[PDB]
Amino acid sequence: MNRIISINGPLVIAKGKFSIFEVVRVGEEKLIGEVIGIENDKAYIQVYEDTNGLKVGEPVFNTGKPLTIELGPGLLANIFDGLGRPLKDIYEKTQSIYIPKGIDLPTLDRKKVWEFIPKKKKGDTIKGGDIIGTVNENGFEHRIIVPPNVEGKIEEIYEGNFTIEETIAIVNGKPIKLYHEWPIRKPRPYKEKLDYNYPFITGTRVLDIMFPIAKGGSAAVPGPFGSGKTVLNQQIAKWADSDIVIYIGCGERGNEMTEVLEEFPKLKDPKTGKPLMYRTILIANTSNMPIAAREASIYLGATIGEYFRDQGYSVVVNADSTSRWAEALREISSRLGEIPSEEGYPAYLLRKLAEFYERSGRVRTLNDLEGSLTIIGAVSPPGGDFSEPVTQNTLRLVGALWALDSKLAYKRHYPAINYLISYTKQWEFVKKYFEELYEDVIEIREEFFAILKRESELMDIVSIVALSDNEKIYLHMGRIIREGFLQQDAFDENDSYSPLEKTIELMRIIHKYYVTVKQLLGIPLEEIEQKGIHEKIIKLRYKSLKEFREEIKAIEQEILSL
Amino acid sequence: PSIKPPLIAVELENPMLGEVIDLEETKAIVIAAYENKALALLFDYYTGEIQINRQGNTYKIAVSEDYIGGIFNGFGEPIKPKPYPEDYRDINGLAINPYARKVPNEILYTGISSIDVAHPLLKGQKIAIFSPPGLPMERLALQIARNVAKDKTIIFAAIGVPSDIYKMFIDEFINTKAIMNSAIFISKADSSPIEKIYTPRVALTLAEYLAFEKNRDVLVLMLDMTNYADALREISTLRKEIPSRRGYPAYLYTDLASIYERSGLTSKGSITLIPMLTMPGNDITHVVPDLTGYITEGQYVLSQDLHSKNIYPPIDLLKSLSRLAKNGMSKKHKKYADILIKSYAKGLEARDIATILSKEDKAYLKFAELVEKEFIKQDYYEYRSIEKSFEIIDSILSQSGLP
Amino acid sequence: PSIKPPLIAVELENPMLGEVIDLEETKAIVIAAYENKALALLFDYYTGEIQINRQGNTYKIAVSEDYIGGIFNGFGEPIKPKPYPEDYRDINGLAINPYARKVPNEILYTGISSIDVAHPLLKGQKIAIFSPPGLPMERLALQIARNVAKDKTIIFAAIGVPSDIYKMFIDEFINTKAIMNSAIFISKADSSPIEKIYTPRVALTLAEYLAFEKNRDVLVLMLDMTNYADALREISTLRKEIPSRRGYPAYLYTDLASIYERSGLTSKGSITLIPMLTMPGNDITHVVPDLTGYITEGQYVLSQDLHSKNIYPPIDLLKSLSRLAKNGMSKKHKKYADILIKSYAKGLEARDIATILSKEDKAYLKFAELVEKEFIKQDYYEYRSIEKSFEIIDSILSQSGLP
C-alpha cells in the first residue's frame, strides 16, 4: 500500500500510514530508515543508506518499533557502524572490502558461547536494572542487567554456557536473555543524579592538571585541521581511568578508525595489564558513509555508554567529530524545506546537541550503584573560528573547554591546547582529590598558570628586543613548562601515557627549580642556564620509568647552588 | 494534521493567538493563526494521533505563596505539592505605568568591593552580568543573592541550563538555608522552546504578585539569557517569518524588553532583577549582549585576563556599568568611585605604555597593579563593608605615590 | 517540457534519482524527482524537441585495463578505441570497510627534500596540494608522479581545466614515456557541470578496479578541485535547494569526502591520491581548501613569498602537513624532521624579530636562511635521495652555528 512520492538525497517522502520515529524499509531493496515527519497522508523519512537509484514506484515497509540496539556481551573489541552493524561480519559475509547497501545483520554474535554466572537466586524478587549475573567478556565482568521495565519474582534461573539468543532465566511468564533492545533516542533511566567526587584521569598532563574534569562530566575539543582532535581523543581512548571506553568516528577518516584496530591490541592497560581493545567499543560511520547514520552513531554510542553505566562502571565516550553530526542535521533540515538559522544550521541545533551532552552524568543506577558517563565531544570549526554555532552552543552545555590553538600547532607544540582560552568549570569539584593526595599541587598550578600568563604578556613585548632579569625568568621557566610538561609526544613509547606519579613529580621538579632561580637573583640568569639544568628537565618526559626516577635525584643534586 | 515535534499543524475553527490546547497526555501553544489553520508548540514530547481540547485561554498560572520553597519548571508545574489554584493570571502580565514607578535610590550592598564602590546595585534596579564562556558567573550570582536577599524572596529562573548549572544554585540555597526562602523554575537544555521562553515569564508573573501585590522585596536571577534568545529564535524559525542577523528574529529587543522591564520599584515593593548571559565568542557587541545592554540599567562585564590572573570576581571595572548607581551614592561615596575609576583607567593606560614613564605614571601603574591584587580580588566566602572597601582604597593610594 | 541548457524539465512516469535518459544525439542525468516530474542535466549541448529513451540505470562505466594508455573525458567516453564493455559498474562505487583497510606505512620517496624529510608521502595515503593562483602546482604534481609512479598506473582526472593545464600533463607523460602507463579523463572548462563532477568519480571507479580487484598500486592526480566544487554548486543551484556559504551546497564536505575516501591501502593493492586546488584569494580558510584539509591526510601548502624569492618548490614547511608520515619514518628519520622544523620555526621567529638578537637566535636565523636557498630550493629535473637530503641538513647545521 505504501509508496514513495519524492526522493531528495537522504530524505525520502512516502505515501501511507506511518507513526513518528518509526523504523521503515525503503524500496524493494528494503533500506533501513526512520520517520521524522508526517504530512497528512504522507510521511517524511530519513534513510540511513544510499538513495541514488530508487524508484518512485517503490514501496515502504513498516516495523512497528523504534530504532534500537542489542545491549549485551559481544560489543567489546568489535567495530560497528551508526546502525550498530558488525563491520567484521559484513567483510566475512560478503568477502569484499566494500560495504553493500541493505545488509541487515545482528549486532552481537549469535553463535558465540558465553559463560553466564548468576548472582540472584530462584524465588528472589527482581526489579529493573538489577544485576541477574555476570559474564566474563574477555577479562571483563559484564554484569547482565535486566530491562528497566520488568518486575517480579524469578520463576526459573539457569547457569553456565549459553548463546546470546538463549534464555538464562524466566521471570513472570517472560524469558530473560543476555541482551535487550533499547531505543537509542530514548535515554536510559537512572535513580538519582549524584555530585562530582572523583576527577577524570585522561593520562595527558594538561587534561589532568591545567584543565581537568570530573567523572560523568562533559568537555569540548574544537579547533581547525592539523590541530590533533583525532590524535588527542584517541589518547583519551588509550589511557583513560575508565572501565569502558567508546570512540565514535562520526564522519571522519576511515584510516583513523582502522588505526584503533591496529594499535590497541598491542598496547596494554596501565591498570589491568590487559589490551586496550577489550575495554574499547568502536562506532564507525565515516565521512563517505551515509550522512543520516552520523546522527544514529551519536545516539548509539551514548546509549551503549549508558548501558555499561547502568551496570555500575566508568564509561567514557569520544565523539569525533560532532561537527559532522551538525552537518547531518543541517543537511536533513535543508531537504525538508525548513528555514535555516545561523550559518545554515537548523534552529534546533542547541537542542539536538543537548540530547547528547545531557546524557553524561555521574548518576545512581537502578540497582543502587555508582555509574559514570563522561562525554568528550570534538568540534571542527571552519578556519579555526571558535565564534561559530556548533562551537558556541557546545560551550554552553559542557563543563570545560579543551581548545586546540593554531599557533601552537604551527610550531609543532603538541598537544596544542591553548592554555589561555581553555577552561574548566569542574575544578572546584576535583580540587579535593589532588589536595588530599598531593598537598602542594594547587600551589604550583596557580604558579604554572601565572608563568604562562605573563609569558604571553611579555610576548607582545618581545617584538622590540633589553628586558629586566625579573622578566627574563618567565621566558625561561615558560620554556620549561611548555616543552617539559605541556608538550607530550603521543607516539613516544614512554611519553604517550603519563601516570600522576610522573606528572606531579614534573610539577615538583619545576617548582623545586623555580624556587632556586628566584634565590639566585642577587647572579645573572645566563650563568644559571649555562649549567644546562633546564635542558635536563625537558628530557624528563621522554624517559621511561626507572630512568626517569634516577634523573630526578640527579637534577636535585644539580639544584644545589651552594 | 502535520506532525513533526515539537511543531504541529492543526485545523481549528477560529483559533486564538497563544491558545492552550489540551491533548491526550500533553499540552500545546497555538503560535500561528490564519483562517481555520494554526501551528502549535508542544510542551514536551508527543507521538500518536491528535481529540483536541481547546481551552480558549492563554497559558495562565495560579498566583500564591505556595511557590516560595518549591522547585518548578518552565510552566510552573510542580516537580517537588501542586500550588493552590489559585487565581489564574496571564503569564505575559501587563506594562507597568512609569507614572506609578519610582526610580531606585536604595543601594543593596553586595559585600564585593569591585561592585559596591564603583557600580553598586540598588533595590529594584535591573542589572545584567556579562561573562565569557567558562568564567565563574554562577558563583557571582550566588554570592550576590547570599548577601542582598537575606530578608527577601529569591526567585530563580533556569533557562536551558545543564544539570550542573541549576543544581549549583539549588545546593547553594540548601547549604545557606535559603531554599525555603526561594522559588526555582527550571527549563532543561533539551526541553521544548515553549518551556524555555515561559520560564522567565512565569518567574516574573510570580515576582510581580509577591512584590507589587503582596508588598515584598524580591530578588530575581535568571540564566541563561543566551539560551532564551536561542529558544525564541527557534520559534521564530518554526513560525514562517523573515529572520534577521544570525537568524534571530527582528523583535528580539522588544521580547528581551518584555522581561527586563518587568522589574523596578513601587511604593508597595520592589523587584531586583539580575539577568545573566554568556557572550558568544567573548564579544560584547554580539546580537545578544548588545541589545541586553540597551535595556538593562548597567551590567557587570567579566574579564578573561583577570580570570587568567586568578582573580575573583574577574570583573572589569572600566567595562562594567550601573546607571542608577549615583542615585544612592553619597557625596563621600561618589568621591571614591571617581578616584578609583580615573586612577585605574590612567593606570591601565600607563600599563600599555611604559612597556616597550615618569614618576606620575609610575604611581598610577602601581595603583592598578594593587587594585587587581587586593581590591578586585576577593574570596568567594568573604564579605566586606563599604567602609572596609574604603580602607583598601585609602591603603592602596598611600602605597602607589598618590595622595 | 522546459528547455534551458544544460538544465531541462521532463514528465516521466515514476523517475529515478541519477537516471540516464538517452535523447536524439545526447544523454542526460535525472537529478530531481517528485511524482511524475523530474529535472535533468545534459551531457553536452542540445537544441530541438525531446523521443525519450529511459535506461532505468545510473551512469555505469565498463571496467577493464583498456583505459590504461588512452585519453577520455568526464564520462569515460573515448577521445583517442572504445573500451571493452565490459562489466558495467556504478561510478559512485561503495563505501570501503575500515575493518578491511590498512593504515599506510610505506613511504613513497619523491626525491624532493621539502617533502621526503618533513612531510613524506606514503603509498595509498591521500594528500592534497594547496597553491596560490599562478604558482607551479602542476609542475609539483608532474615531478611527484615522475618518481613515485615508475612502477604504477597514473590515473589523471582533469576538472574544468584550460587547454594549457591538462596538455601540460599529457605532454609530460609522452616525454617521460609514461603515457601508456597512464589513464587520463578530461572535463573542459566550458563543459557541462555533470561532466565536471563525474570526472573524479569515473577515474576512481577505474582506480578501485585496478588496485583493489586487479591487485595494483595506483597513483591518482586530480585538478582542479576548486572547479569541482564550482561544478557541484552549479547543480545545487539548478536543483532548487537552499544554498549556504558563498552559494555552495551544504553537502560540500560529504561530497568531497565521497572522493578522497575512495583511496587507501588494502592487502591486494593501494590508491595514492593527490588532489589539487587553487585557494581562491590565497586563503587557506576558504570554504574549499578548509573542508579539504578536514578530509585529506595532510596537505602541501605553497608560498607566494618563496615563489617571489624564486624558490621551487615554493612549499611552506611549517604550513604543510602529513598525518600518516610518522608511520613510515624511522627513529633516525624522525630526528631530522624534528630538527628541521623546530629550528626553521625558531628561525622564522628570529626573522620577524632582530629586524627593527643574541648568538643563539643568530644561528637559527641563518639556518632558515640556508634552508630556503639550498634545502627547499630544488631544480625541476633534480632527484635527491633521503641520505642526500640528510647531507644537506647536516651541512646547513654545521654552518649556522648549531651542532
UniProtKB/Swiss-Prot annotation, chain A:
Record has DNA-binding as a keyword: no
Q: What's the source species for this entry?
A: Nanoarchaeum equitans (strain Kin4-M)
Describe the protein's quaternary organization and the partners it interacts with: Has multiple subunits with at least A(3), B(3), C, D, E, F, H, I and proteolipid K(x).
Write out the function statement from the record.
Component of the A-type ATP synthase that produces ATP from ADP in the presence of a proton gradient across the membrane. The A chain is the catalytic subunit.
Instruction: Classify the protein's membrane topology as the record does.
Output: Peripheral membrane protein
Q: Which UniProt keywords apply?
A: ATP synthesis, ATP-binding, Cell membrane, Hydrogen ion transport, Ion transport, Membrane, Nucleotide-binding, Translocase, Transport
* Name the record gives this protein: A-type ATP synthase subunit A
Q: Which Pfam families match?
A: ATP-synt_ab (PF00006), ATP-synt_ab_N (PF02874), ATP-synt_ab_Xtn (PF16886), ATP-synt_VA_C (PF22919)
Q: What is its EC number?
A: 7.1.2.2
Indicate where this protein resides in the cell.
Answer: Cell membrane
